[PDB]
Structure formats: C-alpha cells, structure tokens
Design a protein around this ligand. Structure first.
Ligand SMILES: Nc1nc2c(ncn2[C@@H]2O[C@H](COP(=O)(O)OP(=O)(O)NP(=O)(O)O)[C@@H](O)[C@H]2O)c(=O)[nH]1
Ligand SMILES: [Cl-]
Ligand SMILES: [Mg+2]
Lengths: 166, 170
C-alpha cells in the first residue's frame, strides 16, 4: 500500500518457529487504532507485542493475543495510555483475516487484538476493525489448530519477533 | 443410593464463579483472574447421606451471547447465581439472571441459590440484609461465601442440591 503500513509477527509454537504473518493496517480509515498497533509491533515506545502470547484460540472464530503487561489475558496498554476510545466502526468483521481490537466494553481499547478465522458479524459496532492479514493466512490457520472449544491452547503460541515492513 | 445433578454457575464477570467451582473441585484458590469461556467439571459427593455426581457447568459472566446462554439454562437443573459483595453492579445484575432462568426453564419455580462471594474482603458495598431480602422475595436460599478462605463453598453447592431435591418432590 502507498498509505497503509504493513507489520509482521513471527509466530512460535513452544519456542519453535511456525511462520510469519503480515498485516495491512488501515491507517487510511482508522488512523489512531492502526498507529497504536504499528507502534506496538515495532516496540518503538519501549514496550509492545514482542514476546507476548496468543492466549485464546477458538477454532472457527478467532485467535486473540496482545497482553504484554499482565501476561495472562487480562492486561495490555496502548501508546496513548492504558486505554483509548473506540475510534470508529466503519469497517466490519467480514471474514477470515480481519484484525480487530479486543476490549472489555465501550472505549477500553488497549493492546489486545484478535484475528478472525471466520465472519463474526455479531462483533460489528462493538470492536474496532483496523487491519487485515496480508500474507500468512495459512500460518493463522495453523495457529487455529492449537486452540480448543474454550480457547485454551495445547501449546504456547507466541509472537517471537515483530516489526514493520517497508 | 446414587443420583446426578446438572448445576450451572452464573453471574456477572469477575464475581468468583470459577474460583468457587475450582475450590469445590480442586481444593485450591486461584488468585489470578483467568476469564472463562466455558468449563465443565464432575465430582462425586455425599449430601444428606445420599451419594450423587455433580456435573458443574461454569459459565462466563457475559451479557452479549444471551441466546447461546439459553441452551446452558435449558439443561441445567439448578443454578448458583453469584454476585460479589464488593461489586454493586453484580448484585444489580442478579434479577436479570433470574428472569433468564425462569424464561428458559418456563417456570417460576426453578432450583437456585443466591451466593454473595468475596466475604473475606474489607470493601463491601452490598449489605447482607439487601441480599437476604432479595433471596426472600424469590423464595430461595442466600449463602455468603469466600472462595479465598473456602468459607461457605460446600454449603453453596450442597444447598443447591437440596433445592433440586425439594423441587423434584413437588
Ligand atoms: N478475595 C477474594 N478474591 C476472590 C474470591 N473469588 C474470586 N476472587 C478473585 O476474583 C477474580 C475473579 O475470579 P473468577 O473466579 O475468575 O471470576 P468469574 O466469575 O469466574 N469471572 P468470569 O465471568 O470472567 O469467568 C480472581 O482474581 C479471583 O482470585 C473471593 O472469595 N475472595
Ligand atoms: Cl465477545
Ligand atoms: Mg470464570
């Protein structure tokens, strides 16, 4: 893209490399939310996603991660403070690969995010969609197989490295 | 004798549904918060001299998937309705859970116990009298518990089994 940044996660399974997932971040339509994710992916503020876990993976729905503060699925923080407001609901959860913010109700965006593996239309208007998988959807599909009905993973799925691509 | 009871634990997020259940099943208190999607447990106990298997469904403190939450309620035989004594919103939510249970079971007489959890903490916002009064208006027992100290844990589940047994006698 000429306008939208691309970032990558190198995914690991119990420390062993699984593959790279890259994301287009929709800075053209959701700039504040896209910028948060970009900066957390480069670590340029001194904190971010590198080393954190995909703590909840539910096959047929989504892979959720991004808690680098409590490391247990309850935490996370943004580049703007602990939380920031829902920027807009222009984009919808239209299918596999959609990248969207996890939250605990209105205006509680931090760092946790999820990658859809199916259409999740019931989340429209409640979670801010801000990106999509560009390359490596097969890697997301591979991660999905480590999940379970209740989201607990059979092996530890981590972001072993991450950053921004040219 | 041996019987079996499907118990369903419901209530707002973070009130201690899972901590209460894990104390009953695993005899330890989890201080970390691990949010539930859904978990199920089985335990053989003896209550009033009568042996039974408890099938416990630990549900999430969710308000969005009420339709999905209805199948849980349909098969549940008794409900532990949990609030936290330091969370007024969780107490204000109780009547919604009871209305849901009554709708799904198609009955005004459903075995249930009101549980006021976290009684070990010094930050109470819900008065015992307020909870006792609500339980009296529903005609159901009220039990104060602490998953941390184990106070009332067995009492809450065993009382729910007694309520189911009383309902089956009608
Ligand atoms: N002091 C104290 N803390 C408690 C008690 N019960 C639970 N907690 C704490 O409260 C938090 C939430 O407990 P948890 O059992 O996960 O709540 P839940 O109702 O299952 N939450 P959810 O609806 O998300 O599954 C945890 O940090 C737990 O340690 C209690 O009796 N006393
Ligand atoms: Cl949800
Ligand atoms: Mg729970």
């Amino acid at each position: 893209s000429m306008v939208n940044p691309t970032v990558f996660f190198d995914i690991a399974v119990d420390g062993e490399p699984l593959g790279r997932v890259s994301f287009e971040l929709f800075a053209d339509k959701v700039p504040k939310t896209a910028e948060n994710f970009r900066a957390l992916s480069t670590g340029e503020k001194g904190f971010g996603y590198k080393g954190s876990c995909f703590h909840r993976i539910i096959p047929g729905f989504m892979c959720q991660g991004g808690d680098f503060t409590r490391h247990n699925g309850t935490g996370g923080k943004s580049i703007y403070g602990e939380k920031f407001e829902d920027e807009n609901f222009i984009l919808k959860h239209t299918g596999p690969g959609i990248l969207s913010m996890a939250n605990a109700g209105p205006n509680t965006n931090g760092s946790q995010f999820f990658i859809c593996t199916a259409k999740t239309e019931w989340l429209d208007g409640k979670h801010v969609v801000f990106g999509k998988v560009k390359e490596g959807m097969n890697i997301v599909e591979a991660m999905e197989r480590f999940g379970s009905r209740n989201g607990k993973t059979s092996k530890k799925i981590t972001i072993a490295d991450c950053g921004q691509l040219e | 004798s041996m019987t079996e009871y499907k118990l369903v634990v419901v209530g707002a997020d973070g009130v201690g549904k899972s901590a209460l259940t894990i104390q009953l099943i695993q005899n330890h208190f989890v201080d970390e918060y691990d949010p539930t999607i859904e978990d199920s447990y089985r335990k053989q106990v003896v209550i009033d001299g009568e042996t039974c298997l408890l099938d416990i469904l630990d549900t999430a403190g969710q308000e969005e998937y009420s339709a999905m939450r209805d199948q849980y309620m349909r098969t549940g035989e008794g409900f532990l309705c949990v609030f936290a004594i330091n969370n007024t919103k969780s107490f204000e939510d109780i009547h919604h859970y009871r209305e849901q249970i009554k709708r799904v079971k198609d009955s005004e007489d459903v075995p249930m116990v009101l549980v006021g959890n976290k009684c070990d903490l010094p930050s109470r916002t819900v008065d015992t009298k307020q909870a006792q009064d609500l339980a009296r208006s529903y005609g159901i027992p009220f039990i104060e518990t602490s998953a941390k100290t184990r106070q009332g844990v067995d009492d809450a589940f065993y009382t729910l089994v007694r309520e189911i047994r009383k309902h089956k006698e009608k």
